[PDB]
């Protein structure tokens, strides 16, 4: 588990703000409520990267089946949004958590990106 660079912290805060703003302007009238969330994180992912949302109940939005093992391992070690971190898993790297408010619901936001 590794400390973020100032640039990585700024990027996360910036992305969390854009995801929060997107959701604030997107009415929650979907038949599939999670699709609204996927629209926001698909749109604001940085090039070549993806975003994940985790609910307070421990459910992951945006992940592939192949990724649940490393996502599980990472979050099992992660701290609060007061101390986001990063970890490499072979060819990918997980970064977070960041924080996304959506009305009364709160999510943790993670980035998944090619490792470097």
Numbering used by the authors: 2 to 117
What did the authors write?
Like CpxA in Vibrio parahaemolyticus (CpxA-SDVib), E. coli CpxA-SD (CpxA-SDEC) adopts a PAS-like fold with each globular domain consisting of three α-helices surrounding a five-stranded antiparallel β-sheet in the canonical 2-5-1-4-3 topology. Like other extracytoplasmic PAS domains, CpxA-SD contains a long N-terminal helix (α1). However, this helix does not form the extreme N terminus of the structure, instead containing an N-cap motif at its N terminus and an extended tail region that folds against the β3 strand of the main PAS β-sheet (see later in Results for further discussion of this region). Overall, the monomer structure of CpxA-SDEC is similar to that of the CpxA-SDVib, with an RMSD of 2.9 Å over 108 atoms. While most of these are hydrophobes buried within the PAS domain, asparagine 107 (N107), lysine 121 (K121), and tyrosine 123 (Y123) are notable exceptions. These residues are also located within the deleted region of the constitutively activated and signal blind cpxA24 allele (Δ92–123) and form a hydrogen bond network connecting the α3 helix and β3 strand in our crystal structure. The asymmetric unit of the crystal provided a dimer structure of CpxA-SD where the main dimer interface centers around its ɑ1 helices, which cross each other roughly perpendicularly. In line with this, mutation of the M48 residue (M48K), which lies at the main dimer interface of this structure, did not lead to significant changes in the activation of CpxA or its ability to sense alkaline pH or NlpE overexpression, and CpxA M48K was expressed to similar levels as WT CpxA. This was surprising given the importance of sensor kinase dimerization and led us to conclude that this dimer orientation was likely a crystallographic artifact.
CpxA is the sensor kinase of the CpxRA system, a conserved Gram-negative envelope stress response that responds to perturbations to envelope protein homeostasis. Instead, CpxA senses a wide variety of cues that result from envelope stress, especially those arising from misfolded proteins that affect inner membrane integrity. While extracytoplasmic sensor domains adopt a variety of folds, many sensor kinases (and other sensory proteins such as chemotaxis proteins) possess Per-ARNT-Sim (PAS)-like domains in this region. While CpxA contains a PAS domain that is largely similar to the PAS folds of other sensor kinases, CpxA’s “non-canonical” dimer structure regulates its ability to sense periplasmic triggers; diverse inputs that disrupt the stability of the CpxA-SD dimer appear to activate CpxA kinase activity.
